[PDB]
Amino acid sequence: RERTVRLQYGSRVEAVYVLGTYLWTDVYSAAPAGAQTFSLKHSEHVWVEVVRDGEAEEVATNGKQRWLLSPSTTLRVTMSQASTEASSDKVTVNYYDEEGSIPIDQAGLFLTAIEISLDVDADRDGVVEKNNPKKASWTWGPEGQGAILLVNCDRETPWLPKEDCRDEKVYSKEDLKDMSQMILRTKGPDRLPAGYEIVLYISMSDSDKVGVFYGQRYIHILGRRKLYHVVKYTGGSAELLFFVEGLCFPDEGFSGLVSIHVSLLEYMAQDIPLTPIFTDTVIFRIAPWIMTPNILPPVSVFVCCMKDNYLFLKEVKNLVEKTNCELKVCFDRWIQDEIEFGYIEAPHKGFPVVLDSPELLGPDFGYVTSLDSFGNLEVSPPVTVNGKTYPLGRILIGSSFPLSGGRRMTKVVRDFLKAQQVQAPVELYSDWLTVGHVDEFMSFVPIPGTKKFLLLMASTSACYKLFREKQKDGHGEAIMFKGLGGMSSKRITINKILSNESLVQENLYFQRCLDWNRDILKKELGLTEQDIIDLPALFKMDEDHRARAFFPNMVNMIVLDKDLGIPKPFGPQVEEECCLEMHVRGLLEPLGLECTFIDDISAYHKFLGEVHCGTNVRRKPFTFKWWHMVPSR
Amino acid sequence: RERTVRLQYGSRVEAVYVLGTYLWTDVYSAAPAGAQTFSLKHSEHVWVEVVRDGEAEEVATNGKQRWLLSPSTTLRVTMSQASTEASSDKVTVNYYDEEGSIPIDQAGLFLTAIEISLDVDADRDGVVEKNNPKKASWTWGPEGQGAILLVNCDRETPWLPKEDCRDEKVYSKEDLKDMSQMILRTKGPDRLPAGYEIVLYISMSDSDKVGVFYGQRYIHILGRRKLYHVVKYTGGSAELLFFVEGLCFPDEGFSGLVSIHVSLLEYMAQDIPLTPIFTDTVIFRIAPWIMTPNILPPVSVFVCCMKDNYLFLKEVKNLVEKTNCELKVCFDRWIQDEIEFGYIEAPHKGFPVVLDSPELLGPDFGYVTSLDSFGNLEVSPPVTVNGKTYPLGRILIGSSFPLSGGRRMTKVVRDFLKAQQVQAPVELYSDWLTVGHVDEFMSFVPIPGTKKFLLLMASTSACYKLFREKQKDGHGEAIMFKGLGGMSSKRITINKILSNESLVQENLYFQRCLDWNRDILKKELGLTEQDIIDLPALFKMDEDHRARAFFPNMVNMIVLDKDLGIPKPFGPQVEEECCLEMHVRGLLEPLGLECTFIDDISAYHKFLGEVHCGTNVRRKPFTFKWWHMVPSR
Ligand SMILES: CNC(=O)[C@H]1CCCN1Cc1ccc2nc(-c3cccc(Oc4ccc(Cl)cc4)c3)n([C@@H](CC(=O)Nc3cc(NS(C)(=O)=O)ccc3C)c3ccccc3Br)c2c1
Ligand SMILES: CNC(=O)[C@H]1CCCN1Cc1ccc2nc(-c3cccc(Oc4ccc(Cl)cc4)c3)n([C@@H](CC(=O)Nc3cc(NS(C)(=O)=O)ccc3C)c3ccccc3Br)c2c1
Ligand SMILES: [Ca+2]
Ligand SMILES: [Ca+2]
Ligand SMILES: [Ca+2]
Ligand SMILES: [Ca+2]
Ligand SMILES: [Ca+2]
Ligand SMILES: [Ca+2]
Ligand SMILES: [Ca+2]
Ligand SMILES: [Ca+2]
Secondary structure, three states: OEEEOOOOOOOEEEEEEEEOEEEEEOOOOOOOOOOOEEEEEEOOOOEEEEEEOOEEEEOOOOOOOOEEOOOOEEEEEEOOOOOOOOOOEEEEEEEEOOOOOOOOEEEEEEEEEEEEEEEEOOOOOOOOOOOOOOOOOOOOOOOOOOEEEOEOOOOOOOOOOOOHHHOOOOOOHHHHHHOEEEEEEEEEOOOOOOOEEEEEEOOOHHHHOEEEEOOOOOOEEEEOOEOEEEEOOOOEEEEEEEEEEEOOOOEOOEOOEEEEEEEEEEOOOOOOOOEEEEEEEEEEEEOOOEEOOOOOOEEEEEEEOOOOOHHHHHHHHHHHHOOOOEEEEEOOOHHHHOEEEEEEEEOOEEEEEEEEOOOOOEOOEEEOOEOOOOOOEEEOOOEEEOOEEEOOOOEEEEEOOOOOOOOOOEOHHHHHHHHHOOOOOEEEEOOOEOOOOHHHOEEEEEOOOOOOEEEEEEEHHHHHHHHHHHHHHHHOOOEOOOOOHHHHHHOOEHHHHHHOHHHHHHHHHHHHHHHHHHHHHHHHHOOOHHHEEEEEOOEEEOOOOOEEEOOOOOOOOEEEOOEEEEEOOOOOEEOOEEHHHHHHHHHHHHHOOEEEEEOOOHHHOOOOOOOOOEEEEEEOOOOOOHHHOOOOO | OEEEOOOOOOOEEEEEEEEOEEEEEOOOOOOOOOOOEEEEEEOOOOEEEEEEOOEEEEOOOOOOOOEEOOOOEEEEEEOOOOOOOOOOEEEEEEEEOOOOOOOOEEEEEEEEEEEEEEEEOOOOOOOOOOOOOOOOOOOOOOOOOOEEEOEOOOOOOOOOOOOHHHOOOOOOHHHHHHOEEEEEEEEEOOOOOOOEEEEEEOOOHHHHOEEEEOOOOOOEEEEOOEOEEEEOOOOEEEEEEEEEEEOOOOEOOEOOEEEEEEEEEEOOOOOOOOEEEEEEEEEEEEOOOEEOOOOOOEEEEEEEOOOOOHHHHHHHHHHHHOOOOEEEEEOOOHHHHOEEEEEEEEOOEEEEEEEEOOOOOEOOEEEOOEOOOOOOEEEOOOEEEOOEEEOOOOEEEEEOOOOOOOOOOEOHHHHHHHHHOOOOOEEEEOOOEOOOOHHHOEEEEEOOOOOOEEEEEEEHHHHHHHHHHHHHHHHOOOEOOOOOHHHHHHOOEHHHHHHOHHHHHHHHHHHHHHHHHHHHHHHHHOOOHHHEEEEEOOEEEOOOOOEEEOOOOOOOOEEEOOEEEEEOOOOOEEOOEEHHHHHHHHHHHHHOOEEEEEOOOHHHOOOOOOOOOEEEEEEOOOOOOHHHOOOOO
């Protein structure tokens, strides 16, 4: 950075010189009228060149060479080390008239060199390097650089009703581990020369996105209602350590990028602005919320149910015991239908984070008309789609209107997840279902011993085929819902189901809804028919023309690596086994998937299309780092 | 695009097949219970493959081969030509039980193939090609593709008080030349089969950004308050021609990209949504506003002044006569200080466009608390800055606060121009000046016979040097403002100017303001001191501590290739010439620039820091096409 510093007619000019800049210096303007030539002297730590018409010549400390005064003959002044208390950094210019060789006048430039650098961890290795050249930009990918900030959305103090970033306070030293370090490194004399100060500042727009903290306590200096802070200079070689927290995830109208600036200001006069003679900038990107697909290793299984749902608890406990997961119980289905589990990550730092569509908030566990909802989401395993790799998978958003226009719509979740960028979301149509959730009709499971995964789809046509076979085999009087005494009076048999013509038509329409979704999934996830297994399902149309489950949706399962917790369907009994259970085992068991049917409904004596329990699984994060992605521009 | 179309248990399914898709067809679900094998027949224009476990075999029209019924044995159905009135496109599946070789049941798929394509000029050559593969995206650069839309901001009808895009009407055929063509191309039978319709739609967000128009008149079908339109199918090979207009320039919160969609819908039942069985999308980018630098050829010079400013008119007329420009006169300085001239361009189409900070609006001439203003702008010639090329130059925005934070600020012009992208704007500090305009302290001029350009900067230090020389030479009693009788009583001489110590200090501060700007210009435009010429200027500090011109700012000139219209400074007369005029000629004339001093102030008898005339120049556009740029992401 070349900076203009002119000498002043017959006078001395004092200036601070910031390392990594250099000066071009007018000597012509300060020359007395009549002067024809100049000479110069300079101290040892100042490099001076005479520059005529772009041609530079280095000049000695203590010569007596003279040059013609000309508008286009200037000086270039460079320093590489900071001034100390013992420094006499100066350039002095003598001016001569035609006749004599004694100087008629002198003009001086007295310099104090300082180093000033606002440093962040732009190379993403967890330590704050010195003046990364790329610290003022943010680039994606393995060769990308740019510092990363977490949203401080967990809670260090159960005293507080809110998450940590909701205030302008830091109570615990532990909190600083969620924050990113930013260091203002300076080198120079004991004091700044008279008339200078150093300020740190942010934009008003960024003031609800960041907080900056500096006895030995925690002072809030920038953020909500604080855009400008005067810094106290320490002389010699000094480091001022700041902690930065993110307050806000990327969203519609917020890219995730925030900036912090330092400037060295020069006082001119009262009533006149200070002159910003040097500025340095750092950029942070706020880490996105990332959802965890079913192929990632399970750590904890969270379950909600009523206290006397004993079979459910027993069978879930049992399922989880076949794994190394822990079970957490809360005493209908909010843990699944209100809430999604994901995580955030920065270099050597990260924690699980819950998104709520209006608890678990503590240390290292954070919290956060629409046609979509945070409780109506699924996420694929990593996929490659027509050459493009999606290493964190893609999110599926269940929507009442997954099209691009034709009506007024608010899609708050689509907007939020699109802003996260890294799981490039895809909308699906879920509002043909009474309950309205994508997890009632699709799931993903690993193929054990691979590598690969399957999409599981609910299928009415698979159910009809199965029931028609059983009827043909002589089992038409097989009874459904055995052991649900509240259903017994309906005496629902295969024959009764298959005779109901209206039900056939309803389920043909629902199969159209499933297949429309299937086609989007195959295109947007890069799947073939070889990647899909259809599980038998059956619905009844409600008065709003939506699909109510006729029996429990088996696709809405708990996936714990090779172990599957599948809702018990209470299907027609053939040879004293559920034909639906036997059918599903026949589909999944050959792949090495282990099926456990979990009875969530017996405690209620009947099934009316709703289940009254929920589950969610906290999983280990991807090993792939989000910042190594290159998202679409 | 693979699409799911299942056969229906023992029944016939009728479907529309859209060219560029293909079907995968379940035959297993439609099989009667007990059936073990199937065969198939198909018509000549349908390709059918049997696919087992991902392995496809092409099947004859009229064989008798049988395959085991299996969930994982399906059909793949492909067509490449549209159906006509004579077409019998069908696949029929026969099912057999173990024993007999007579079919026990049949299921049929009856197909109508159509072509449907929403086409735009994505290859940017001005003709609408057939189904450009890239039409649903927009990419920058010489190898970029994506259709371009102009803001229809000119006026075809002087009857109308507003510009054309301000309504949902098109009055003149001439208007359609400002619009982009979009063609819905179809091929198929006389009618769509029963239960289908074609719709065009946009988002609510895009409804104030676009209008779409289809007797032989102009019907508004999409745009403000119109998000959805049912299209009337014409059979055979048909083209439906639409005209699209842009309503809005890119801005804060609008990228410039808009989408239009077509879908083929299938009717299912009353009270149930239609199924979108096919969708096609096109993208437009709205062309940015581009400002014209002083190196571009002048076409028209617009001047405002009072009717009796005869010398001004005479001297401007004279200046323009040395060129081939036309002169347009309007009877203080709104043509310069309220208004900026630029242009918009699409393939084989474009016109000049004026931006107003609250007339010329007619055919092929369009119209459009803040710390910035559209009347406070300059633009560089094309520059290369640290390797990055800026082929349309960069805009300089004069600001009262050109820093990135520390206070609440609205910067409407910065936001708007940033959104245009292609002239990557740079903020300068202009509010140290009473009038507050960047054109009072900087200009750009071509070096004739090149190639190259110079930055011209106002300089107080150049003025002081000149006056001190003249005083030394014995001309201290030289009088300023000769011929301005309203100034005569002040008897302002060089000696009087140079004796005023307060004035020296004021102008030293103003030189600091100039140099701060100089340093930004050099860094952001890639300039050295070799590219800059300093013109003498002098200010007096007003009561708000701002700089009022002491004599006319010569830098604020009319640039007509090699001819410069420079404000007459009314400087001290030495040997009966203005020493300021002689000095400026000495700087510029050696470069082949021709200087004409234009007296704008004599008619007022005095100078108090304001000039009461304005000029603006409409120039030819860059030959470089904006869409060949690659802007920073
Ligand atoms: C006024 N408020 C405050 O200073 C702080 C304190 C509480 C919170 N405030 C934030 C606050 C609020 C409003 C501000 N406006 C400016 C400003 C104005 C014009 C230009 C300008 O940039 C340039 C100036 C020169 C050149 Cl060549 C190019 C650019 C900045 N600043 C300045 C600071 C400042 O000059 N203060 C000030 C002090 C005295 N008085 S004095 C000289 O005696 O100190 C009298 C007048 C003023 C305006 C600023 C901001 C961010 C980063 C660097 C700066 Br240099 C504001 C700061
Ligand atoms: C209702 N308003 C209107 O149609 C038009 C007319 C004036 C302006 N309106 C715009 C308007 C307003 C609201 C709309 N809501 C939808 C909609 C709803 C649910 C899903 C859905 O997408 C899918 C449906 C199925 C699958 Cl698998 C996957 C996705 C779309 N659409 C549909 C059209 C539609 O289905 N209309 C309709 C007609 C009857 N009645 S009927 C069947 O007798 O025609 C009864 C109910 C409805 C909802 C739409 C929009 C854009 C592009 C394609 C479509 Br397919 C609306 C259109
Ligand atoms: Ca580091
Ligand atoms: Ca906090
Ligand atoms: Ca915390
Ligand atoms: Ca923490
Ligand atoms: Ca074309
Ligand atoms: Ca119009
Ligand atoms: Ca028009
Ligand atoms: Ca026009």
